């Protein structure tokens, strides 16, 4: 009950892989076996399978959230009904994945969404993958089992994951869920790999300071204040900052922080603050630039991304877009026009499609791999993307 204090390390995970390979059954099995062995609340298949709608970045996704504990860590776990839900969750970052559990049915081996989820995992920055080789109660041989293991390792290595070093558990989500002790032990083995193989993620407060600028105003004879929600890290009074994006990078010092009309010695991740800057004039700083720890973020104009285009039902476009489409790219607190390069042999992108897009913005913005953005056009949200590779 001390767990109400939430002092144990927290890790965000999820089940990925092809439809019907056993992702929901495994999720229910993990909660049930861990509840029996260590204490917790068990969750049934139907509760997880009936995923509620949740809105991401203007996009509706069906996502089920569960939580479970191991003796040393707390897990928040996501599971989704359809492939489209995984596409949207992964691109928008709506569900954080510090690690993923790739579920592969031993009976079918890797399938088209198995490959797609590994590929997207790499592009969106999912740092670690552990494999649960499912339906092993249906495969009594070893030649097919060692073969599927080999194919999974090669597939992971094809997309730069370390296939040779990947933990692969051979189990049966159904039989463990049904209470068979031999198969429940394979669930404990999986949870042991969550503990040992996925490192404790870095908390936003421990990352280098970043604040996306919203409002800018002057305090007569004291300097310019910029407002925003601290995205990550901490800014302290007396620390130096870089002002990155849109214009040439500038340097300044934090001389004050205020929140709810209270003067503070610091601004922390998630706080809606105002930051007073030394020797910066009101006209020299604007919305869409970021305040950041010096040397930790650079401005870029060109990048590779993975983008999901909203369907008609999600309130997106009714018709496809083509090469020549020059829409607005929404980065943190501003929008910027960009020119797009589609993949070789692609002339149109239908509503509901996801594709790799190479974008060139009209001016630079502060960005790193993993930064999310929206695509908007007169005057609605038509897409959502993630920066896969900064090009310059």
């Amino acid at each position: 009950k001390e767990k109400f204090e939430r002092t144990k390390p927290h890790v965000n995970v999820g089940t990925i892989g092809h439809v019907d390979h056993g992702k929901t059954t495994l999720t229910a099995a993990i909660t049930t076996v861990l509840a029996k062995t260590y204490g917790g609340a068990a969750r049934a298949f139907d509760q997880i399978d009936n995923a509620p709608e949740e809105k991401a970045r203007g996009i509706t996704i069906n996502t089920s959230h569960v939580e479970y504990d191991t003796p040393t860590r707390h897990y928040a776990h996501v599971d989704c009904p359809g492939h489209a839900d995984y596409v949207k969750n992964m691109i928008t970052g709506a569900a954080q994945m510090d690690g993923a559990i790739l579920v592969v049915a031993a009976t079918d081996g890797p399938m088209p969404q198995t490959r797609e989820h590994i590929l997207l995992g790499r592009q969106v920055g999912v740092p670690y993958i552990i494999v649960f080789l499912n339906k092993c109660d249906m495969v009594d041989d070893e030649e097919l089992l060692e073969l599927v293991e080999m194919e999974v390792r090669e597939l992971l290595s094809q997309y730069d994951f370390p296939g040779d070093d990947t933990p692969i558990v051979r189990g049966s989500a159904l039989k463990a869920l049904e209470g068979d002790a031999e198969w429940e032990a394979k669930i404990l083995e999986l949870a042991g790999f969550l503990d040992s193989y996925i490192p404790e993620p870095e908390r936003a407060i421990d990352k280098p300071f970043l604040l996306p600028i919203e409002d800018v105003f002057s305090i007569s004879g004291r300097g310019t204040v910029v407002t925003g929600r601290v995205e990550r890290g901490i800014i302290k009074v007396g620390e130096e900052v870089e002002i990155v994006g849109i214009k040439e990078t500038q340097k300044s010092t934090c001389t004050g922080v205020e929140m709810f009309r209270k003067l503070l010695d610091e601004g922390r991740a998630g706080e809606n603050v105002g930051v007073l800057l030394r020797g910066i004039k009101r006209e020299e700083i604007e919305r869409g630039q970021v305040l950041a720890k010096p040397g930790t973020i650079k401005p870029h104009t060109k990048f590779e991304s993975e983008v999901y285009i909203l369907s008609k039902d999600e309130g997106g476009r009714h018709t496809p877009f083509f090469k020549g489409y020059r829409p607005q790219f929404y980065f943190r607190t501003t929008d910027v026009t960009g020119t797009i390069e589609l993949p070789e042999g692609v002339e149109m992108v239908m509503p509901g499609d996801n594709i790799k897009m190479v974008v060139t913005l009209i001016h630079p913005i502060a960005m790193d791999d993993g930064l999310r953005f929206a695509i908007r056009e007169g005057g609605r949200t038509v897409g959502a993307g993630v920066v896969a590779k900064v090009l310059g």
């Binding site: 105003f217 204040v225 004050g256 709810f260 003067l263 809606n272 930051v275």
Partner: peptide, 13 residues
């Protein structure tokens, strides 16, 4: 600054 519970705003001096 200029806020008070949670909307954008500030001050600094």
């Amino acid at each position: 600054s200029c806020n008070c519970f949670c909307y954008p705003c500030c001050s600094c001096x």
